[PDB]
Design a protein around this ligand. Structure first.
Ligand SMILES: *[C@@H](C(=O)O)[C@H](O)C(=O)N[C@@H](CC(C)C)C(=O)NCCCCNC(N)=[NH2+]
Length: 439
């Protein structure tokens, strides 16, 4: 009788997050088969060495040992052990006699990660009094449990916060309760205009980024107003007013920039693009003609498409997403995100604004802080970052999925890329120097 080994593969081996040498048992039938265990990847950095048979003293079973590093991340991480017959060199067969015998190793996440944060330049950082914990909800009902990871917080807007989150009047509006004139805007010819925004996620994202940009360049823009030969109709557009502390019923009074998009741009049910709204506001490009009934193009002698402070990049792996986020965050740029996937049974594509990110001790990006013009509260919401494939030896694609803490469910929604808006310092400085050279 040939000895065999058996293992019930439905049982994962789940070591704790701490570093250590962990063990599981393999049943040895009719003797002690001469075999050697192997990880499916030998290069996984968080496993030190090969598995070994650490005890055979029990005639009925062997103990297998393997050694892990500490899992500092907030995600489980997987490895796989198979077994080779030391004589035939073949992999030993599992229970069905056709698949190789495989043991699933799942090292558990760190329950006490140390977290640090990076925020878009110039918006400050949340105080503890500005951070709001979130109730774990299930099927739509709060369980009165809360998400306990400390990076899971809403960043509440107050009189003192410096991010921007313009919200859709069409989402906030309650018919028969809100004022009948909720949607009215006083236009440029101080005419009365009623704008809707149910499909303007791209314009809300553009407006948030433009508020940040006008604030960061406020001194340059004051000089521009005084030195440039501004077109008469455009003069009132060289400011930004974002009024914090308003009620939902007063959202129409909150942002002059958002109101410009809502009054004069488009609300096509097909949507728009962040970068198109940004171009439309800042300089002339032929493609952005007919985006709306006016063309602000407010700084056309500062910027052109060749000197554009607007960039669009894509990401399909953890490495690419993280490279892009870090480059953007270390460079004084505002961040628009295009989300892509499925929400329910319908295709989903959405533009939101990102104001910062949380990192674990390995500098993995674990959560983003999002201005979400579709969500009701005047806060930034946390969106957790998750990966479906290995993050240590990455596949060709490993998309950056989003966890919706507000819906308290995972969704098949991921980040396709970023549209970023740079301060444009070199361009502004060159414009200013050219004026002083003419004086
Ligand atoms: C977002 C929203 O208001 O919820 C809105 O639907 C939207 O603009 N979504 C974007 C998502 C990213 C900006 C990619 C979108 O899908 N834009 C596609 C615009 C295509 C318009 N096509 C034509 N022919 N006009």
């Amino acid at each position: 009788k040939k000895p065999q080994i058996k293992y019930e593969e439905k049982q994962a081996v789940m070591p704790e997050s701490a570093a250590g040498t962990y063990t599981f048992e393999v049943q040895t039938i009719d003797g002690k088969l001469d075999y050697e265990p192997y990880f499916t990847s030998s290069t996984l950095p968080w496993i030190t060495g090969a598995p070994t048979i650490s005890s055979r003293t029990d005639p009925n079973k062997d103990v297998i040992s393997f050694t892990c590093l500490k899992n500092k991340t907030v995600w489980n991480r997987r490895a796989y052990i198979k077994f080779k017959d030391k004589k035939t060199g073949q992999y030993i067969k599992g229970a069905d006699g056709k698949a190789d015998l495989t043991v699933n190793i799942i090292q558990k996440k760190n329950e006490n990660p140390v977290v640090h944060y990076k925020w878009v330049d110039g918006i400050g950082a949340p105080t503890e009094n500005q951070k709001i914990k979130m109730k774990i909800k299930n099927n739509g009902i709060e369980t009165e449990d809360y998400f306990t990871d400390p990076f899971v917080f809403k960043w509440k807007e107050t009189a003192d916060t410096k991010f921007y989150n313009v919200r859709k009047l069409d989402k906030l509006y309650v018919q028969g309760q809100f004022p009948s004139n909720y949607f009215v805007i006083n236009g440029i010819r101080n005419e009365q205009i009623q704008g809707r925004d149910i499909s303007q996620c791209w314009a809300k994202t553009a407006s948030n980024m433009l508020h940040w940009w006008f604030e960061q360049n406020k001194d340059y823009i004051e000089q521009y107003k005084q030195k440039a030969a501004i077109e008469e109709w455009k003069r009132p557009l060289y400011k930004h007013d974002y009024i914090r502390g308003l009620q939902d019923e007063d959202e129409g009074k909150k942002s002059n920039i958002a109101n410009i998009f809502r009054a004069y741009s488009h609300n096509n049910a097909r949507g728009g693009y962040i970068e198109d709204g940004l171009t439309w506001y800042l300089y002339k490009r032929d493609g952005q003609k007919n985006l709306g009934s006016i063309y602000p193009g407010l700084f056309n002698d500062v910027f052109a498409h060749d000197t554009s402070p607007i960039n669009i990049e894509r990401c399909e792996t953890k490495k690419e997403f993280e490279q892009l986020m870090n480059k953007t965050l270390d460079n004084k740029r505002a961040i628009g995100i295009f989300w892509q996937g499925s929400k329910g049974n319908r295709p989903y594509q959405h533009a939101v604004t990102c104001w910062g990110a949380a990192y674990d001790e390995d500098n993995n990006i674990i959560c983003l802080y999002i201005a979400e013009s579709n969500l009701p509260e005047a806060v930034l919401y946390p969106f957790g970052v998750r990966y479906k494939g290995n993050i240590y030896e990455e596949a060709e694609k490993n998309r950056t999925y989003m966890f919706n803490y507000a819906l308290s469910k995972p969704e098949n929604i991921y980040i396709d890329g970023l549209t970023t808006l740079d301060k444009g310092e070199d361009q502004w400085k060159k414009w200013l120097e050219a004026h002083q050279k003419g004086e």
